[PDB]
Ligand binder design. Structure first.
Ligand SMILES: *[C@@H]1O[C@H](CO)[C@@H](O[C@@H]2O[C@H](CO)[C@@H](O)[C@H](O)[C@H]2NC(C)=O)[C@H](O)[C@H]1NC(C)=O
Ligand SMILES: *[C@@H]1O[C@H](CO)[C@@H](O[C@@H]2O[C@H](CO)[C@@H](O)[C@H](O)[C@H]2NC(C)=O)[C@H](O)[C@H]1NC(C)=O
Ligand SMILES: *[C@@H]1O[C@H](CO)[C@@H](O[C@@H]2O[C@H](CO)[C@@H](O)[C@H](O)[C@H]2NC(C)=O)[C@H](O)[C@H]1NC(C)=O
Ligand SMILES: *[C@@H]1O[C@H](CO)[C@@H](O[C@@H]2O[C@H](CO)[C@@H](O)[C@H](O)[C@H]2NC(C)=O)[C@H](O)[C@H]1NC(C)=O
Ligand SMILES: *[C@@H]1O[C@H](CO)[C@@H](O[C@@H]2O[C@H](CO)[C@@H](O)[C@H](O)[C@H]2NC(C)=O)[C@H](O)[C@H]1NC(C)=O
Lengths: 345, 345, 345, 345, 345
């Protein structure tokens, strides 16, 4: 038997009229290409750039009746990647590429197997820098959906139709983690069917779900800002007449609330709208600011001038024992309404 | 009928004298090319680099009378992107590229349809790193216009003329957001007509409008610096003779004003001229600095030495009750004139 | 004798039927390729990206019986790297490339020696950006394993089998250090044998071990946060009635604990889960926060109103001498359980 | 008349002996090439890297007597950029490239016009990453000169001579700004004439001048550090015996001077030598440090022990009223000598 | 005389049997190549990456007896860089490339002159990203040696031998500075002679010396941390009984020592071991921490309870006048031993 590298040059040569610029079943039914991807790497999810890079194996399967053979004995051939330009291949591309390239190290990472009845299996290795828009209106408590869609560039719906295969359309590698997200093990597979002023093009997409982990922002940002609000409240139990003690506890509590918020903006993303962590640090700044405005009333009622001196110091102690109950209670109402409206979403 | 890949090699081959180095209507009227772009991605608007990257579909339409055909039955052909060098194409380029590339993943993302009367439709996919100059003299309250212009490189105005088409010249994709701006849904389409010492070249441009979002700088920078100025004012209601209380409230208020301004410069852009957020933090530093210079007068008039001791402590209380009205009032005048002169622009 | 550049063009030319698209021993036993790498550079271990770049010499050895020669006298030939496409080479690739390239400066850095019995030695120089997942649950006290695996792309296990050689499979260059790790001088060499829906492909891997150095985080982060907890404890020896001294020592100790934690997050990695350095800074924040809640009880029991005044000031001194022993003792229990549970791992 | 694309293939074909590897006027006088650049973009002036990127149109004009024609009627031809290798072009390069590339988007951005007497006009579009050394010994008050030189690589001075043209040798685009500099509208045009151990090569250069803007460093760094030195001086007017007031005003003024200097190093460049802004923040730290050493003398003379108690408290008030004049006066002498020695440069 | 571009095609054509895949003096003595580099640019010395980029002219000189000519009159020819593949060139490469590329802007920056007796001069322009390991155990006081070695890839020592020339082997351009180092004007030139399991390959290297500048770390980090230790010592001269004055001077001195160390870690490199600047900031933290532990003893001995009250206050004044001498003296001993052990290295 003749070797398979020369049997393909007889099957696709100057004879038999095979042209790699003409789709199979030309002027007939469309070409049904079935696809599945295999994700090797995933991550570096940027929020300044709003993209994420991924490393996949793209497998494509179509039927080419011009490549059916019956003389050669073996059930499958394998075309070398140097001779790849002599095959009609689909013009799949990604609608949100934002940059992508092949892998060409030690061999072009390509693969092409032509079966006996003409089924063609074409697997390649691609690095993508896919773009997904992100909605950071509740930043530590958010789920980010990042799609991945696969259009056709030059053939319309009456010529070429993409499908996912019905047996494992998207697999993900096992030991694959992320620094700031987790990847849920459920994928949404649907169509999009892009229209233009050119024609109905085909496309298929796959959605992913990214639940952001929580435990860093509690230990570093929520719990330390929580304790500073508690330290604002020990002024109501410190003596009234200890005037350097109350205002030294006042501003130095709103200075460590300023340092806690300023030093943590370097770790946060730089979007220009208000988050959920931004309204925590703002309202917790308002409880520390309100503690010194309480003492500014106490240091003025009690200093105000026996009948009337007994009256005014009774009023400044009344405004103190009320606020021992009111400021933990009002802060507990905010601490309910905050976590309810951001866990329910 | 002969297949379309060989009908184009008869239409553009060694016969018929078609040369891809000669424009249509040579030594005649100019070539009218009509263009429209479709923006897929948009963002990473840098201010250190003063650029922005964008991902478009560039569609071009011209008429080539050498490519009119009448033997072949179908109304449109489609040239394969490998055979692209056998077509006269316009030398469009972007006058502010600053770097750009094509997309070549799984197929060269190109498209070329030759109609029956010779109308040629040429769509490609380009990633641009277009450069727009930015004017940050009022940084949180600003509108940034970033143009996008499309010159001709080697053909002058008497040979090649660019136009926008009169049916949707610039579309933008739907789910397309930005981290720090919003994109207004109105586009300005005009000419520029570049002159050189070479000749009148043609160009068309498209302007975009970028209103910067506000809500981050209020919650993180304006409102916290606002409250620190309020805490400077509780010293006028704290007792005069409480000398460690007044000056402990003094410097620790101008220390949390220093920390608020120093820790927020990391989030701001690094231009070397004065912004509108820079004059907020500077004038708000002058109100906290002025509160301790008030007490430096009070701690000197009252300490100055019955007739004359009653006189001087009456003067130090007079300078205190005036400033209880004056410092909220002067700060309210600045709070009017600031927001009027930066919302009117 | 004819020169070796023309003896290879006789050995691999149009005559003898040598085809570079057909593996040796075709339709026979598989091809046994034995491999060894030589690491020149190593480092830039990112944790945001979770990768590391490396610079190796990849040596491959296989036997090709089509390239055995006996007319030419010398024991070894050497094919020039321009004529490299006329040799069957294995399609080795790295399963976690994440980007890689060759070196082409002043010559393509390739090498190919064909021995007399057909043994082929193929050495190249590759820069890899290999991806390894990292587990930072105990950040200063951690060992990071980063693998390096070498699959086959198009030939299955019945056609091509990779091996390490039994004489020094992985060497590392001598003067090769890292900024944040040390590299242990022991390598684990094993198989992986990747399965797909395509076939059993071969792969070999090599594990490395990276013990993180310690001495920076002690001097910069553990010891300074240790001393701030000691300064919280000098309040129990300062007088009870010195009310501005106790609370000035209180908040300014929890302000320098806030500054110590905020200013050190810029040096730490930005994962979104809790580390071991994150629970040090959190629990050490709880001991400084607890010191002022101690004095809030002392300043309330002693102020509470001879028989009963002698009773209450005796109780506030009792709660002070207990806490002189209890807070160094409770902190020593945490200081045991922390370092035991993170040195035992 | 024959079309111009075939008239050039007759003018430069196998006939007439035109060789693109031989300069015009070979073994005769040198080739006089006249050059002018047109700057489109300018900026991203790095100081860590010490470079700046620029985007120019490089126009070159020389005379080639082999390309003179008289049969064809029109005064100018235009060679297509695909056929560019059939023309002798000068080997101009930039002596401080540090990286550069062409622009190849939608057409190679090249241009070549051969006049009737043989004058050749060759315009291209280049992105350069030119390197200029910077001298930051007085950082906010500095002028940076960044040159741009254009050598010849393989032809010496007796073969090829570069010139600027005498009609606008360097133009700059109109709406072109910088984030941290301004560009003066005067250019210095001179020669350099590089010598080596190879031969006298030609080169021309063009200098630019970059005056750094001022207004950011005044508002953010000079004026806030100025006001902290003023707050050190209100201790001399606060009472002597107010011991917690004086030292609370002392260290908290040198703490807000520490925060002002530490938080502003992130915005400054990271050179490893002393600037002019570095000696401002250092000497202004010495005036705040000297204010507390003044009170350390006052709190020791007055505490030192009627005749002798009247003597020592008279001496501690004498050392206070002297320093009310001396510290504004000594700081004003530094405030003169500083701004004189950095505006005169 | 025939033109030189055709005389080289006669000297290296199909006739005369010249093969560019065979070294000169084949099966004879080795090839003596003499080399010298000319450094144009130098810098961006990274410490996270541990590399540095450089821009050189690499000149190589060897003798090829196949290229000797005597018919043509002129003493030197010059081969055009398009025809470069018809010359045996040495396979020099850099053993620590870590990435490198050529320069191809406006012409390939190459040069090749064949003398009359066959001496070949080959100069090219290369941008290298050479890797040098750095030892930051004493960070502001260190000398960094970064080598640059030039191996041979495919020819062993019995075939090809590199040498430096004996007339200026390494020159450096004149106006060439660095942001954080200075470059000493002395170069070490030596051999390395790499051995492998392949053969004895040749290599030559050149060492450079980089003394780090000092003046930034004194003004920004050493002197400000020096003055904070002095402010710890003014508590021994402030009154004993001024209890809010002593502890307000205590923690606020160790807070400005925390801010001085935290805010300066952003400018320092991120190695994970202890530097010399790291032990300065740590020991200077121990002197400020020790000043408050001194007063914690004074505030307990003097408060401890006429005979015995006179005894204990005499002991608390004794422990104060000792420490007025001891803490400047112990700090001066550390200030000797530190600068001796880091200037002697
Ligand atoms: C590609 O897939 C579609 C769906 O299987 C096929 O289209 C149908 O084919 C049957 C006959 O084979 C027709 O009766 C239907 O009218 C077709 N359309 C639809 C919507 O069902 C198509 O034949 C396939 N083409 C190829 C080459 O396999
Ligand atoms: C390209 O567009 C312009 C405008 O439609 C055309 O120029 C005019 O054409 C008419 C006749 O067709 C002339 O009467 C006018 O004098 C032309 N100039 C102007 C300013 O109106 C031009 O013909 C078009 N060329 C092609 C090939 O379509
Ligand atoms: C490649 O390596 C394997 C192992 O050495 C060889 O496979 C064995 O070869 C012997 C005879 O040579 C057989 O008896 C065994 O059945 C084979 N399999 C196993 C699992 O041991 C193989 O021959 C080698 N192929 C070449 C070309 O060298
Ligand atoms: C290139 O420019 C120089 C200067 O114009 C020319 O060199 C001079 O040419 C004249 C005659 O044309 C001689 O008398 C001079 O001796 C030349 N040298 C100098 C220094 O003036 C040169 O001829 C020009 N070459 C071409 C091809 O135009
Ligand atoms: C390359 O350089 C070496 C040293 O000059 C030469 O090797 C020596 O050549 C002489 C005769 O020319 C011999 O006697 C020596 O035995 C050689 N070896 C040593 C170590 O000295 C060599 O000839 C030169 N080769 C060429 C082509 O120039």
């Amino acid at each position: 038997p003749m070797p398979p590298s020369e049997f393909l040059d007889k099957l696709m040569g100057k004879v038999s009229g095979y042209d790699a610029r003409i789709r199979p079943n030309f002027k007939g039914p469309p070409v049904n290409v079935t696809c599945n991807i295999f994700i090797n790497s995933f991550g570096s999810i940027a929020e300044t750039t709003m993209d994420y890079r991924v490393n996949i194996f793209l497998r494509q399967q179509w039927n080419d009746p011009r490549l059916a053979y019956s003389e050669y004995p073996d059930d499958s051939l394998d075309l070398d990647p140097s001779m790849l330009d002599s095959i009609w291949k689909p013009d799949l591309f990604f609608a949100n590429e934002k940059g992508a390239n092949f892998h060409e190290v030690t061999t072009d990472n390509k693969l092409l197997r032509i079966s006996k009845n003409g089924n063609v299996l074409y697997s390649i290795r691609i690095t993508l820098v896919l773009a997904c828009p992100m909605d950071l209106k509740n930043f530590p408590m958010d789920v980010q959906t990042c799609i991945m869609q696969l259009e056709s560039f030059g053939y319309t719906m009456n010529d070429l139709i993409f499908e996912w295969d019905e047996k494992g359309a998207v697999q993900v590698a096992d030991g694959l983690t992320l620094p700031q997200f987790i990847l849920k093990e459920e994928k949404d597979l649907r169509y999009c069917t892009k229209h233009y002023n050119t024609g109905k093009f085909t496309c298929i997409e796959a959605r992913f779900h990214l639940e952001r982990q929580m435990g860093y922002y509690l230990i570093q940002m929520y719990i330390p800002s929580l304790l500073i609000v508690i330290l604002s409240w020990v002024s109501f139990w410190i003596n009234m007449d200890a005037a350097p003690a109350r205002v030294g506890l006042g501003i130095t509590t709103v200075l460590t609330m300023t340092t806690q918020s300023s030093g943590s903006r370097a770790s946060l993303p730089k979007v220009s709208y208000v988050k959920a962590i931004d309204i925590w640090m703002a309202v917790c700044l308002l409880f520390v600011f309100s503690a010194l405005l309480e003492y500014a009333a106490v240091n003025f009622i009690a200093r105000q001038h026996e009948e009337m001196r007994k009256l005014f110091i009774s009023r400044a102690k009344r405004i103190d024992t009320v606020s021992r109950v009111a400021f933990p209670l009002v802060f507990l109402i905010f601490n309910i309404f905050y976590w309810i409206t951001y866990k329910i979403i």
